[PDB]
Amino acid sequence: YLRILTEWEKNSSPGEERGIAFNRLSQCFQNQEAVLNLSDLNLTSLPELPKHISALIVENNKLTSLPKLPAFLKELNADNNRLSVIPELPESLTTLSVRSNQLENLPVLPNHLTSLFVENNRLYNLPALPEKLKFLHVYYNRLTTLPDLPDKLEILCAQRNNLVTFPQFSDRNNIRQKEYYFHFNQITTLPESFSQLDSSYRINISGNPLSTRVLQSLQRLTSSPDYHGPQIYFSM
C-alpha cells in the first residue's frame, strides 16, 4: 500500500502540498486513525483511501472526483472542491457535506443519513430523502421540485432555487421545532394542508410569485384571532 501512495506523490503539482498528504495518509493507515483530514492542500487527486476511516475531511482543495469511500465512513466533508460527482455512499454515512462544489445530481442517499449539506451547487434533482434526515441545505441550486419531506426533518434551507411547487410535508407527524426556508423561488400556489400545520413550523416563502388568491387567503388566515398555525413569512 505504501508504494501506491509513494507513486501518487510523484506528481507534485504547483501548490499541491502532496508531501503533507503522504505524511497524513501513511500516519492514518499505520496508526488506524479514525479521521483523515487533507484540507487546504490544493490537492487535485486522492489515492486509495484507508478503508477503516470514520471521517474523511478534504475541504478547500481542487478535487474533481473522489475515490471509493471506505465501507464504514460516518462523515464525508468535501466542501469547496470542483467535484462534479460523488461516488457511491456507504450505508454507515450519517453526515454528507459537499457544499460549494460543481454537482448537478446526487447518488442514492443512505436511509440513516442525518445531515446533508449540498448548498452552492447546480443540482437539478434530489434523490429520495433519507428517513432519519434531520438537517438539509439545498439552497443556491437549480432544484425545481423537492422530494417529499421525511418525518424527522428539522432544518430545510431550500431558498434560492428554481422551485415551482410547494413540497409535500410529513402530515405534522413531527412535533418538534422546525424551520423550512423557501424564499427566492417560483412557487405560485400553496396546498390546503398548510392551513392545518401547527405553530411548530417556521416557513419562509418570501420572494415568491405567490398568486393574488394565495396571498389574500394567507392574509385572511393569519389576520384571524384564531390563527395557531405556522410562523409564516411572505413578502415580495
Binding site: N120, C157, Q177, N204, G207, Q231
Partner: protein, 379 residues
C-alpha cells in the same frame, strides 16, 4: 442607551446576509461592527424609539448579570450557563452580489440558545444586586435577549464599489471593512418582560412592553416620516425666538462633535425622564427651551431634539456639508437637492411607514433631510 455611528459598507454586508438567510423574517442585521461583540447569545439589547422607528443598542449586560441562579440543566455551575446552553446549529454560505468583493461567498456559523433553557425563563426572579445599566433603563424602552447569532468563521476583508446617488448630485471609490473572526453579523431576539421589579419572563411571539406594570394596552404611534417631520417643525415654531436661538446654537455645536452630541442627548433624555432642571447645566438654555412659559416640560420638544440628535448618527460623512450650509446660509439649496435625490431614486420614501427596513443610502438621505429641515426652520 445611545446608538453608534453609521458604518455603511458593514451594514450592506450584514443586510445581504439577512436577505439570503431570513428574507422578510425576524433575523436582524448588525448595523455597526463596533457592536458585533456585544450582540452574542445571552447578551441583553436595548430598544429605543427614534425618528426612523426603533434602534437596538448594546448594553454590555448578559442574562446572568440580572438572573438569580432529561434536559441536562441541573448543576453546570450556573455561572458558565452561557457556554453550555449555546449550541452550534450549523454552518452556512452567503453568496455576495457584484458590488461586494472578498479578499463570491462568505462562510458563517450559527449559534442558538437551547429551547430547553429558554423554557426555564418563566417566573424567574431577578438578582438582589442589579447593575446600574439595568435598573436605570428608561421604563418605556424594551429589552431583548439575543437567542440566535450568525458570525464569521475567520477574519474577512470586504469591499463595496457601490456608489450612492447623492454623492454626485450634491471623490471616493471603494469602501473597505475588515471583520475579525467569530464576529456576529446577524442575530435574532426574544423579548424580556418584567411584570414587577422582582420578576422576569420570556416573551416569544407578539409585540409587547418589557415593563408593563401599571400600563394598559395602547395603540402605538403610526405616523409616517413626513407627518413626524412636520410636527417637529410646528413644535419649534411654538418657541420664543430666544429659545429658538438657544436650540439652534446648541444643535450647531454638535455637528462633527460626537461627544457634544452624546452628552446633549443624554441630558435631554435625563430632563425628559425627570421633568426637572437643576442649576448644574452649562447647556441649561437648551434644557430651558424644553419647558413652556409655565415652567412645565413639553415632551414634544425633548423628543424632537432627541430625534434630531439620533439622526445625526446616520450622517458619518455629511455633517461638514450641513455645517457649511448653516454658516453660509445655503441650507435651502441643500434641502432641495436632497428632496430631488429622494424623489428621483425612491418612491414616497419621505412617507415611509414607521419602522421600515432602510437600505443605508435611503436612511442616510432621510436623516440628512430631517437634520437640514430642522436647522433651516430654526434659522
Amino acid at each position: 442607551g445611545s446608538g453608534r455611528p453609521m458604518f455603511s459598507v458593514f451594514e450592506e454586508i450584514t443586510r445581504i446576509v439577512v436577505k439570503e438567510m431570513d428574507a422578510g423574517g425576524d433575523m436582524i442585521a448588525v448595523r455597526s461592527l463596533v457592536d458585533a461583540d456585544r450582540f452574542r447569545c445571552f447578551h441583553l439589547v436595548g430598544e429605543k424609539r427614534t425618528f426612523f422607528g426603533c434602534r437596538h443598542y448594546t448594553t454590555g449586560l448578559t442574562l446572568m448579570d440580572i438572573l438569580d441562579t432529561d434536559s441536562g440543566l441541573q448543576g453546570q455551575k450556573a455561572e458558565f450557563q452561557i457556554l453550555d446552553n449555546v449550541d452550534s446549529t450549523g454552518e452556512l454560505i452567503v453568496r455576495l452580489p457584484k458590488e461586494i468583493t472578498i479578499s463570491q461567498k462568505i462562510k458563517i456559523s450559527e449559534n442558538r440558545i437551547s429551547q430547553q433553557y429558554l423554557a426555564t425563563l418563566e417566573n424567574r426572579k431577578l438578582k438582589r444586586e442589579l447593575p446600574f445599566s439595568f435598573r436605570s433603563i428608561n421604563t418605556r424602552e424594551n429589552l431583548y435577549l439575543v437567542t440566535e447569532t450568525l458570525e464569521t468563521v475567520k477574519e474577512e476583508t470586504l469591499k463595496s464599489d457601490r456608489q450612492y446617488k447623492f454623492w454626485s448630485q450634491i471623490h471616493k471609490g471603494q469602501r473597505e471593512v475588515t471583520i475579525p473572526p467569530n464576529r456576529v453579523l446577524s442575530y435574532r431576539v426574544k423579548q424580556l418582560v418584567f411584570p414587577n421589579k422582582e420578576t422576569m419572563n420570556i416573551h416569544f411571539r407578539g409585540k409587547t412592553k418589557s415593563f408593563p406594570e401599571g400600563k394598559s394596552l395602547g395603540s402605538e404611534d403610526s405616523r409616517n416620516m413626513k407627518e413626524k417631520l412636520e410636527d417637529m417643525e410646528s413644535v419649534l415654531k411654538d418657541l420664543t425666538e430666544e429659545k429658538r436661538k438657544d436650540v439652534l446654537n446648541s444643535l450647531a455645536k454638535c455637528l462633527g462633535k460626537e461627544d457634544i452630541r452624546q452628552d446633549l442627548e443624554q441630558r435631554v433624555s435625563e430632563v425628559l425622564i425627570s421633568g426637572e432642571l437643576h442649576m448644574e447645566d452649562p447647556d441649561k438654555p437648551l434644557l430651558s427651551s424644553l419647558f413652556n412659559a409655565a415652567g412645565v416640560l413639553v415632551e414634544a420638544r425633548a423628543k424632537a431634539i432627541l430625534d434630531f440628535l439620533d439622526a445625526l448618527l446616520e450622517l458619518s460623512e455629511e455633517q461638514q456639508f450641513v455645517a457649511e450650509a448653516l454658516e453660509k446660509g445655503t441650507l435651502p439649496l441643500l434641502k432641495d437637492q436632497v428632496k430631488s435625490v429622494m424623489e428621483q431614486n425612491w418612491d414616497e420614501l419621505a412617507s415611509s411607514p414607521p419602522d421600515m427596513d432602510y437600505d443605508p443610502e435611503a436612511r442616510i438621505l432621510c436623516a440628512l433631510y430631517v437634520v437640514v429641515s430642522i436647522l433651516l426652520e430654526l434659522a
